[PDB]
Amino acid sequence: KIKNYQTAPFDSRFPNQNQTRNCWQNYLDFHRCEKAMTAKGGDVSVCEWYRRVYKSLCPISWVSTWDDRRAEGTFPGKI
Amino acid sequence: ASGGGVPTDEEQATGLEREVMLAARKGQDPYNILAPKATSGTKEDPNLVPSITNKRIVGCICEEDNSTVIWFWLHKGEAQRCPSCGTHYKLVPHQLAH
Amino acid sequence: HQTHAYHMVNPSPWPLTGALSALLMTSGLTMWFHFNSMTLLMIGLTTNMLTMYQWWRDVIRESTFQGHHTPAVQKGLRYGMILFIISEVLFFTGFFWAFYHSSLAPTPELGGCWPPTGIHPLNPLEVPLLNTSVLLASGVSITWAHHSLMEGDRKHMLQALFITITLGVYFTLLQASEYYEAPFTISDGVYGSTFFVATGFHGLHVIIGSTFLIVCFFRQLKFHFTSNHHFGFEAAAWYWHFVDVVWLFLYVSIYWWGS
Amino acid sequence: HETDEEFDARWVTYFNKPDIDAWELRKGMNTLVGYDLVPEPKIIDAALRACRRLNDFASAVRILEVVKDKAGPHKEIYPYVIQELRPTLNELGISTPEELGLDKV
Amino acid sequence: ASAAKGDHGGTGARTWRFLTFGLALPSVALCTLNSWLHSGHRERPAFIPYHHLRIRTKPFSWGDGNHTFFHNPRVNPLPTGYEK
Amino acid sequence: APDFHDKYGNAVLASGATFCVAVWVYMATQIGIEWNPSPVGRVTPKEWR
Amino acid sequence: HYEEGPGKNIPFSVENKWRLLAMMTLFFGSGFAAPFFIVRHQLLKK
Amino acid sequence: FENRVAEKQKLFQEDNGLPVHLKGGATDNILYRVTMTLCLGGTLYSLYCLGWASFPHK
Amino acid sequence: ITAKPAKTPTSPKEQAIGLSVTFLSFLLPAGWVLYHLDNYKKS
Amino acid sequence: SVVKSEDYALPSYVDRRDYPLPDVAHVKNLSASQKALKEKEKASWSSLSIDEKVELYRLKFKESFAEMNRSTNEWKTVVGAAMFFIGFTALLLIWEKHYVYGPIPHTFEEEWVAKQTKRMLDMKVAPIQGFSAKWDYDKNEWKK
Amino acid sequence: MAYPMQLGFQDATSPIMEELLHFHDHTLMIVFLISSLVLYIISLMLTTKLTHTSTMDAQEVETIWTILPAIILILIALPSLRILYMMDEINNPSLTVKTMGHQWYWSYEYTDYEDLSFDSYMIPTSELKPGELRLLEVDNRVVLPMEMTIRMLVSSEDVLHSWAVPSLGLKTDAIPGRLNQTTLMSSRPGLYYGQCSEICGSNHSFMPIVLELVPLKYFEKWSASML
Amino acid sequence: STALAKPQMRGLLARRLRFHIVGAFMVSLGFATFYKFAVAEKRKKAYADFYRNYDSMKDFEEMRKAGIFQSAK
Amino acid sequence: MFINRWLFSTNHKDIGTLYLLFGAWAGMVGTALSLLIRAELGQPGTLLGDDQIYNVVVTAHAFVMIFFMVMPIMIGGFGNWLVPLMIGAPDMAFPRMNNMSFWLLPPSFLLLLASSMVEAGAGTGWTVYPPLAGNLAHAGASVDLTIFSLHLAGVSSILGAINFITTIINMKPPAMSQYQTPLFVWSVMITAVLLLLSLPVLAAGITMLLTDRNLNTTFFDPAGGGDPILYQHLFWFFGHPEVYILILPGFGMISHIVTYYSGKKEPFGYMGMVWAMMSIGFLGFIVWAHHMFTVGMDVDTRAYFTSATMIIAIPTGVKVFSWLATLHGGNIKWSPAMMWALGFIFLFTVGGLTGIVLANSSLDIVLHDTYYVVAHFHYVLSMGAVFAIMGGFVHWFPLFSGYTLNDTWAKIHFAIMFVGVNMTFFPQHFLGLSGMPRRYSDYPDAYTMWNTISSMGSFISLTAVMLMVFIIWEAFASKREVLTVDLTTTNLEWLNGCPPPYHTFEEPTYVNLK
Numbered sequence A: 001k002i003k004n005y006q007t008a009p010f011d012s013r014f015p016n017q018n019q020t021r022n023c024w025q026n027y028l029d030f031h032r033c034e035k036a037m038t039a040k041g042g043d044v045s046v047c048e049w050y051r052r053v054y055k056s057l058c059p060i061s062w063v064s065t066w067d068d069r070r071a072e073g074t075f076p077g078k079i
Numbered sequence B: 001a002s003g004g005g006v007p008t009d010e011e012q013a014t015g016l017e018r019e020v021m022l023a024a025r026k027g028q029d030p031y032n033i034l035a036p037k038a039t040s041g042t043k044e045d046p047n048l049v050p051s052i053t054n055k056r057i058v059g060c061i062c063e064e065d066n067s068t069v070i071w072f073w074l075h076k077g078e079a080q081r082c083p084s085c086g087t088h089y090k091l092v093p094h095q096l097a098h
Numbered sequence C: 001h002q003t004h005a006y007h008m009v010n011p012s013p014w015p016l017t018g019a020l021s022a023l024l025m026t027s028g029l030t031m032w033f034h035f036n037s038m039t040l041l042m043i044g045l046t047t048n049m050l051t052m053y054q055w056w057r058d059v060i061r062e063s064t065f066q067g068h069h070t071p072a073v074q075k076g077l078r079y080g081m082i083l084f085i086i087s088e089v090l091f092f093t094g095f096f097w098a099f100y101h102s103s104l105a106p107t108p109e110l111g112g113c114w115p116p117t118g119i120h121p122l123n124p125l126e127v128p129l130l131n132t133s134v135l136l137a138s139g140v141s142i143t144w145a146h147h148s149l150m151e152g153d154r155k156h157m158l159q160a161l162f163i164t165i166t167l168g169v170y171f172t173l174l175q176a177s178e179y180y181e182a183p184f185t186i187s188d189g190v191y192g193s194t195f196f197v198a199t200g201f202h203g204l205h206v207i208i209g210s211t212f213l214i215v216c217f218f219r220q221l222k223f224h225f226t227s228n229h230h231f232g233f234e235a236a237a238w239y240w241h242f243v244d245v246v247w248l249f250l251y252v253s254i255y256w257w258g259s
Numbered sequence D: 001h002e003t004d005e006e007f008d009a010r011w012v013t014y015f016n017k018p019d020i021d022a023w024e025l026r027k028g029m030n031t032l033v034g035y036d037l038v039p040e041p042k043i044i045d046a047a048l049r050a051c052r053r054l055n056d057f058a059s060a061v062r063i064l065e066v067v068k069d070k071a072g073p074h075k076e077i078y079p080y081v082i083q084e085l086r087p088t089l090n091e092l093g094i095s096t097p098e099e100l101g102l103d104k105v
Numbered sequence E: 001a002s003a004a005k006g007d008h009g010g011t012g013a014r015t016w017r018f019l020t021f022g023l024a025l026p027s028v029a030l031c032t033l034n035s036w037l038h039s040g041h042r043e044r045p046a047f048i049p050y051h052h053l054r055i056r057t058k059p060f061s062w063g064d065g066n067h068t069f070f071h072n073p074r075v076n077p078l079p080t081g082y083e084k
Numbered sequence F: 001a002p003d004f005h006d007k008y009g010n011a012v013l014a015s016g017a018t019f020c021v022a023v024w025v026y027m028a029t030q031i032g033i034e035w036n037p038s039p040v041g042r043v044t045p046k047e048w049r
Numbered sequence G: 001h002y003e004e005g006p007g008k009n010i011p012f013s014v015e016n017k018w019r020l021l022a023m024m025t026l027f028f029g030s031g032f033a034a035p036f037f038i039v040r041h042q043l044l045k046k
Numbered sequence H: 001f002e003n004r005v006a007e008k009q010k011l012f013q014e015d016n017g018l019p020v021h022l023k024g025g026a027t028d029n030i031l032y033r034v035t036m037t038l039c040l041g042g043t044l045y046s047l048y049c050l051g052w053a054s055f056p057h058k
Numbered sequence I: 001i002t003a004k005p006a007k008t009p010t011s012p013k014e015q016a017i018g019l020s021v022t023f024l025s026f027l028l029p030a031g032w033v034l035y036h037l038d039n040y041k042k043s
Numbered sequence J: 001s002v003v004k005s006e007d008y009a010l011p012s013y014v015d016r017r018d019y020p021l022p023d024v025a026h027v028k029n030l031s032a033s034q035k036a037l038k039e040k041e042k043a044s045w046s047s048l049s050i051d052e053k054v055e056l057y058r059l060k061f062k063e064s065f066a067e068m069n070r071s072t073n074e075w076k077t078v079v080g081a082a083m084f085f086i087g088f089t090a091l092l093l094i095w096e097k098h099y100v101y102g103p104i105p106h107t108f109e110e111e112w113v114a115k116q117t118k119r120m121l122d123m124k125v126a127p128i129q130g131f132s133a134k135w136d137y138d139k140n141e142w143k144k
Numbered sequence K: 001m002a003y004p005m006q007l008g009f010q011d012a013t014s015p016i017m018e019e020l021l022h023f024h025d026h027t028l029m030i031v032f033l034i035s036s037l038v039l040y041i042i043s044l045m046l047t048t049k050l051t052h053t054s055t056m057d058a059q060e061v062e063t064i065w066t067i068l069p070a071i072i073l074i075l076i077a078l079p080s081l082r083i084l085y086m087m088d089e090i091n092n093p094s095l096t097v098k099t100m101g102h103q104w105y106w107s108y109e110y111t112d113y114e115d116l117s118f119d120s121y122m123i124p125t126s127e128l129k130p131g132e133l134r135l136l137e138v139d140n141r142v143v144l145p146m147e148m149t150i151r152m153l154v155s156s157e158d159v160l161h162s163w164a165v166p167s168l169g170l171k172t173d174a175i176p177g178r179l180n181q182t183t184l185m186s187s188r189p190g191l192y193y194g195q196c197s198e199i200c201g202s203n204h205s206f207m208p209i210v211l212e213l214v215p216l217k218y219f220e221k222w223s224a225s226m227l
Numbered sequence L: 001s002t003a004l005a006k007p008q009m010r011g012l013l014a015r016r017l018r019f020h021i022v023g024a025f026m027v028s029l030g031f032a033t034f035y036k037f038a039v040a041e042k043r044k045k046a047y048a049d050f051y052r053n054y055d056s057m058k059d060f061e062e063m064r065k066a067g068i069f070q071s072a073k
Numbered sequence M: 001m002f003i004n005r006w007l008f009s010t011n012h013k014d015i016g017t018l019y020l021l022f023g024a025w026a027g028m029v030g031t032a033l034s035l036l037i038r039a040e041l042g043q044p045g046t047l048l049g050d051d052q053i054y055n056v057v058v059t060a061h062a063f064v065m066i067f068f069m070v071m072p073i074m075i076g077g078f079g080n081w082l083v084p085l086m087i088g089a090p091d092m093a094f095p096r097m098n099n100m101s102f103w104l105l106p107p108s109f110l111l112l113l114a115s116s117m118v119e120a121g122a123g124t125g126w127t128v129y130p131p132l133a134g135n136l137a138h139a140g141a142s143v144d145l146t147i148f149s150l151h152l153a154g155v156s157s158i159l160g161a162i163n164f165i166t167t168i169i170n171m172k173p174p175a176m177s178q179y180q181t182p183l184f185v186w187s188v189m190i191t192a193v194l195l196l197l198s199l200p201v202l203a204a205g206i207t208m209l210l211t212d213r214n215l216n217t218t219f220f221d222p223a224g225g226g227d228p229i230l231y232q233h234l235f236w237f238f239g240h241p242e243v244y245i246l247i248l249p250g251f252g253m254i255s256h257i258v259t260y261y262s263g264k265k266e267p268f269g270y271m272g273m274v275w276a277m278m279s280i281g282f283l284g285f286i287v288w289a290h291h292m293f294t295v296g297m298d299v300d301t302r303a304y305f306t307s308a309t310m311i312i313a314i315p316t317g318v319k320v321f322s323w324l325a326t327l328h329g330g331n332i333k334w335s336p337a338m339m340w341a342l343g344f345i346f347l348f349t350v351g352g353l354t355g356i357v358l359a360n361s362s363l364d365i366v367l368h369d370t371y372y373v374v375a376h377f378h379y380v381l382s383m384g385a386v387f388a389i390m391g392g393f394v395h396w397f398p399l400f401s402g403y404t405l406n407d408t409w410a411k412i413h414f415a416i417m418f419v420g421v422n423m424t425f426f427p428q429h430f431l432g433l434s435g436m437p438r439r440y441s442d443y444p445d446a447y448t449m450w451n452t453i454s455s456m457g458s459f460i461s462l463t464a465v466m467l468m469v470f471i472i473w474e475a476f477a478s479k480r481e482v483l484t485v486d487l488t489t490t491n492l493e494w495l496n497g498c499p500p501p502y503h504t505f506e507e508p509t510y511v512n513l514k
């Protein structure tokens, strides 16, 4: 549905050297989306761009900590 | 609304604060709080430099706004002249607080 | 015999005891944080208080009793107190800067929002607003004390000053009770860190300012102040207004805007 | 601030004051040698004659010295100046530093 | 602003006392009212062991090392949750 | 009357200089200091793999 | 009052130049040596 | 209270050569000695503590 | 500046002594630590 | 003629090319013949002899311009002494190399360097100017 | 890498580092002219017996000496800020690689498609292979495609570090809780070296960076084989 | 015995300064000229010439074959 | 008598004397630390075999030189001796507080010594950045002893600043305006305003670090929502004004020494020199993030900090050209103080110039945290400042002691020091351009030659330093008493004799208005 993914493209919302909020925002968008789908008995596949974008950008240890904290119920962002 | 009970400096000031206050009252300045005014500074009309001893340092600002001040010891005796501008200064020694 | 108006001070041990009391307080905080002991710190705090007490006692002997404060001396001390309040305003500025830095760009660990997830701020329209009216009122009363003194009115100077001091104490006890009631702590992230360090150093300054006004109260009771010569009272008032203004910035910044 | 002719006449008059005193002699010479010039013979001539009126032969020789000094490496300047003052030097009986051997180190 | 009052003839001791008892202390009484009236224990929130809160990178230099200096058992949970 | 410099100047200049050149040339060349200068124009490259 | 004049406005004696040598030695020598003995100290703790 | 500042002005301007921190009398001496004993004693004890803390206590 | 002749002249010999003792006071204690660094490193 | 510490507040003598007429005479107490010389100076200077004229100069001034401006040999003591202490420094460094420094890493052995230089050229280190630029890869030698 | 007796910068491997060299050459020429004009004037002022000690008027000369520096500074700032904005312009990278600093080694994550990551430690001197470089080689180099714009994202999992490669003109601090970005483009294949550039404890001197730049098809196979 | 001509007697220090400041500016132009040619243009030409016919695949193949890479043998 | 004079002092000159003694002794500690640094680097491989000790040595070297050598000597030492003498004042405004500022320094220095003796010392760099300075990567008392050391040095210099500003504003003769005080007295007043404003912010930031390490705050800790980079902004918000604080009294001393030995009554363009110091002191507050060009800062922030940093070169150049113009036309006396001052004009200019290369955030990417920065600041800071201190010390030594130095020995000392510092630091430019990181205990093999030469230069400066100690001994040993001093008419501090009486200006000077 419009692919050929190499890496995350420039995003004009996050145009500077600190990219922490870019990684965070795409992690949030992916999981929010996947909440919406999974629930609405829709399909997780539409959430893919955000999965691709955050996996490219986010340190593995950060994704992994945020994933543990979601399971634990102590993740501080709203999903 | 009013009432008293607070001392005044006249009543309670002491030591050097009181000396300075009582001298100001008579328009004298024994503790060098004010800048002296220049005379014409000629040999006939020398600036007169009070001192309590026989020599005092003078700084001369030769012209208004000069940033450089000219410093020299002024000795009791005949008038001396600033080494830069020649204006005359003569020492007038002695004494203070009775 | 001098013929300038400045004060040559007698040789004094208080500079060395204050310097040694700094060594004992700081090495004593090290011993408390690391070696589980309060002994050095208690000695340093005690010498610091002895040093302050004898030191400022001597300043009063020199002024009220010996007459060393000529107008030129007094003007010096004015500049000195203004320069000091300026250094304190800068110290505060670094804590405001920490507060704004953390709150305007909340990080992912916080939830990306301010106040962080899981923080419930105090309501600024409750005790915090009471504290604002209490300090602003003490700025009015101390100004009444100042006009009473200048006018020669012993009993109203006293009463306006007592009221100022009571309002300072009341702010201290209200803030102490807020600290106890607050559901967040200094260890609750940068929210708790900024809140308690900034308000805590402000709290310390209210206590120092109220002690300075209490010393003025006792000096006024012993008739030290003349209706025209009372710099210790003016310095304490300036410092008190400083503490009142820092409070207003804290209230607008942390309690109101940061809630 | 002024022409060269006016500067020189100012200084000529200064030293020509008949009752110029010893202080005023020393103040003139000491201030004059602060400028970026070698003094004209006419200024020097007036200052030498001031030395005469003040009975001070030593300062007249010192004045000749300071002329040579102010010329720095321009060797042609001092002999030109001495040339020009020769009638005054003869008239007042002022010997040059070189004639008194005070140029040797 | 002038505020909404008047005087300025002179700001002497009488005027500052008038402000102390006629504006400043009445404000303090009002806010004391309003506060001690919106007081009374609000009900505490579910404990959630968020990793950004209840920080402990070193034991505190007092008590058991794990209680804050103005610890209030009713409203300050420990890292492991509210006290028993 | 000759001062110190008139008497000892030539001597202090000439031995200080000889001495200084001697002991630096010796430190720099005889005691095993590795200066690590450029290989260019001086090392023959040798197979390493 | 206090002594004044060359050699008297200082908290050390310059009365004897050999005792002053010893003093200046200990003074400057102890500041210069201190970092060496601090490095030795740290290397000796392991 | 009454104003006793004049008494105090006389005490402290007494021409006895005492420095201001000792001019009030024997109590100034005692307080001075307690303060200097605590600063010097506490300073010797901070050095002791550095001595102690300078070495590993295994 | 002009000054008076020395009140207690320090002859060349005395200068060689003060210079030599000054230099040793910086050189020897530091020499000693540095010379023994290995003795320290392997304790 | 003796200058004392207690005279610091009084005008003093100086020889300076830029202050050629100092505040006081070099000689303040004259001998009897120095005095009559002062007396003679009030008459025509043409009747003074060269020695009288020389001695009138020496009573007013200490040194002449030629004298006070003379160059000296101090530069030789300063430069040779500075060389000497610089040379002494090298004794210190020789001591430190002998007694303090142990052997340097094996990577500075001649054979290691030859190999490392080959590997730097195989990886074309600084090929545009710095290093490999200086090797002739066609002729297999350093560029001449 | 640097080589023995080097005086200036490592040769440029990237178009940006080449720009920096030419900008350094322009600024150094300014620095040398100024420092030697000042040394020259000092010698000039000290070499004449001519004197002039009366008061000198300053308000003419102070124009020259304010305008002329102001102009020189503008002549440095112009090319300076051109480079600065040029490094900053939108790049479109083909690849993103993360590096995390640790005490005392780097880890790299290439997670655009597969989950590839590894650690990269200095080769100890006793373990070097003949011809290899003391303090510079690592076990696992950062392999990357040559002639391709790569986005590097830098962070740390403990104290600060800083990831630097001098010949590519690169240095970006590595801060825990922060993801900094920089972009890398090599004009040439080869091995390009750097070292940690923010003090991070006893082994700060011993956590180097080695880039290995090769054609995309080698990079692709190398990646696949590191899974 | 002939008279000495009158020489320049005024502003000799100012004259000396003007002369040398001027000569210092000349020397600054000279040095810039030399330096543009010996450093700055040399660099530009070194890079220009190096890349003009550069072949990055050939450079890689030579490095691959010298055994330098971990990823390419 | 001794205790009263030297422990309970309320006298500006004696307090100044104690600051000079303290600073001299600190300069020996700092020098020994610098020689340890350069020994470690003097050949490839390890010397200390322990790089935590190397980093502790690096950190202490910087804290000792800056806080315990330069500031005490220049502001405590010359400031106190010279400032009241130069305005005809009878003492400082707060002559008893003046003495606490002195006495806080030995305890501050003792804390810093304690930090290096306990645990494994604080091997943090003098920036003390978290997280390396926090309680996990530096557990234990050492870093907190460093923080307390800096607290005590901060209170010292803040009370000093208040006392000097007050003294200089309140205690001149009634006729002398601010535009009639000597450049050295303006350089002190402006150093003091910088200290007053910059230290309280360093204090807030290190107090936040102390609370991070001990009270579970997280200002600089991302787990609690903090940011390491907040600390750098608070530190450099102080640290850049600190570098102007370290040079401004040396610029005041240089203006006095050049004027004097050029035989001039006054410095060229006085009000230009006042304006230049105020301009530099002001700009010194809006440039600090040039210390942070690689932390990941927006391109517009970098462009601004580059352009604002460069502008400082304009007023600084007016000073350099105005010193040249004060030499111009002078009757030059080639005294040893004059040689220090001429070597200061040239070497400060070199170093300010490499600061302007670094101000370019584009080049600073490659130069940041390399030896090019260490080279820059050893020219402009270590030599600038050290040459101003040595020129001021040799110049005023006879005022403070009553005794003359041997000038030949002092020319020798200068020659040696000059050769040493340039052999030491000039090669460090090449090391930085070629990429050698700073804060390293060892270096890739290609860096050996310039590091070897730099280490041998260090030993030359050591010889110069031993020699200075001897030169001072020889002065006190010989007791040549000062008789006459030229140019007193424009150098008021000399007019009461050498050494001046305990109390000077008991009768103030007389200055007319007109």
Ligand SMILES: CCCCCCCCCCCCCCCCCC(=O)OCC(COC(=O)CCCCCCCCCCCCCCCCC)OC(=O)CCCCCCCCCCCCCCCCC
Binding pocket: K007, K008, K009, K028, K031, K032, K035, K036, K039, M350, M354, M422, M423, M426, M427, M429, M430, M433, M453
């Ligand atoms: C100490 C070891 C010296 C090693 C020298 C180089 C070896 C050549 C081999 C090798 C054979 C040469 C072939 C290789 C070409 C190099 C290409 C390059 O990329 O080039 C970039 C290079 C260019 O570097 C050079 O071209 C080296 C020359 C140094 C600059 C001029 C100063 C000369 C004085 C040096 C004497 C030593 C200490 C005294 C310096 C005094 C302080 C400045 O690196 C620099 O930019 C460093 C400059 C730092 C900035 C300081 C600026 C102001 C300096 C002072 C000027 C004083 C005026 C008179 C100067 C007055 C003289 C006193």
Ligand code: HEA
Binding pocket: K034, K038, K068, K069, K070, K072, K073, M126, M243, M244, M246, M247, M290, M291, M309, M310, M312, M313, M316, M317, M318, M320, M348, M349, M350, M351, M352, M353, M354, M355, M356, M358, M359, M360, M364, M367, M368, M369, M373, M376, M377, M380, M381, M382, M384, M385
């Ligand atoms: C005396 C102390 C001192 C002084 C006065 C200065 C002066 C300056 N410094 Fe420096 N500086 C330091 C001490 C000093 N510095 C220290 C200690 C550090 C490192 C800290 C650390 O990390 O530990 C440092 C670090 C430092 C950096 C950070 C580099 C890095 O870490 O990457 C930068 C960045 O811009 C900077 C720039 C400057 C500039 C532009 C000046 C300017 O103020 C200089 C202006 C002077 C001149 C330009 C020369 C005179 C002028 C002329 C002759 C006129 C004509 C000139 C031109 C037109 C250019 N300095």
Ligand SMILES: CCCCC/C=C\C/C=C\C/C=C/C/C=C\CCCC(=O)O[C@H](COC(=O)CCCCCCCCCCCCCCCCC)COP(=O)(O)OCCN
Binding pocket: C029, C172, C175, C176, C179, C180, C181, C182, C183, C184, C185, C186, C187, C196, C197, C199, C200, C201, C203, C204, E068, E069, E070, E071, E072, E076, M151, M154, M155, M203, M207, M210, M211, M215
């Ligand atoms: C009521 C008004 C406030 C008065 C403060 C009372 C306590 C003791 C004295 C110190 C006062 C101010 C110092 C400010 C610094 C630290 C924080 C203090 C503010 C405070 O008191 O905060 C309390 C935490 O206290 C803690 O850790 C207390 C730990 C006490 C250790 C003191 C800190 C020592 C280190 C600071 C040294 C200061 C150095 C500054 C130097 C000045 C610069 C020259 C908050 O309580 P909590 O249980 O976390 O939360 C409440 C939940 N119910």
Ligand SMILES: CCCCCC/C=C\CCCCCCCCCC(=O)O[C@H](COC(=O)CCCCCCCCCCCCCCC)COP(=O)(O)OC[C@@H](O)CO
Binding pocket: B012, B013, C052, C056, C057, C059, C060, C063, C064, C069, C077, C081, C207, C208, C209, C211, C212, C215, C224, C225, C226, C229, C230, C231, C232, C233, C235
């Ligand atoms: C429970 C206690 C714990 C608290 C810890 C600290 C303790 C509290 C300290 C409270 C401060 C008390 C200050 C008392 C000063 C009294 C002496 C005084 O006020 O001295 C006056 C001069 O003022 C002067 O020195 C002005 C003096 C300036 C004093 C400034 C005080 C502020 C000190 C603040 C310490 C801050 C630390 C902040 C932490 C970051 C005397 O001159 P006058 O009044 O004109 O009298 C003369 C007339 O009588 C003649 O007619």
Ligand SMILES: CCCCCCCCCCO[C@@H]1O[C@H](CO)[C@@H](O[C@H]2O[C@H](CO)[C@@H](O)[C@H](O)[C@@H]2O)[C@@H](O)[C@H]1O
Binding pocket: I027, I028, I029, I030, I031, I032, I034, I035, J092, J095, J096, J099, M035, M036, M039
């Ligand atoms: C960075 C600053 C340092 C600069 C260079 C220091 C210069 C050296 C000065 C000499 O120092 C000494 O020299 C020794 C040897 O030459 C030592 O003797 C050692 O050597 C011996 C002979 O090898 C024995 O006799 C002794 O036990 C002894 O410990 C030693 O104790 C030491 O004081």
Ligand code: CUA
Binding pocket: K101, K102, K103, K104, K160, K161, K162, K196, K197, K198, K199, K200, K201, K203, K204, K205, K207
């Ligand atoms: Cu990692 Cu330095």
Ligand SMILES: [Cu+2]
Binding pocket: M239, M240, M243, M287, M288, M290, M291
């Ligand atoms: Cu800076």
Ligand SMILES: [Mg+2]
Binding pocket: K162, K197, K198, K199, M368, M369
């Ligand atoms: Mg860095």
Ligand code: NA
Binding pocket: M040, M041, M042, M043, M044, M045, M046, M047, M441, M442, M443
């Ligand atoms: Na090493």
Ligand SMILES: [Zn+2]
Binding pocket: B060, B061, B062, B070, B082, B083, B084, B085, B086, B087
């Ligand atoms: Zn005058």
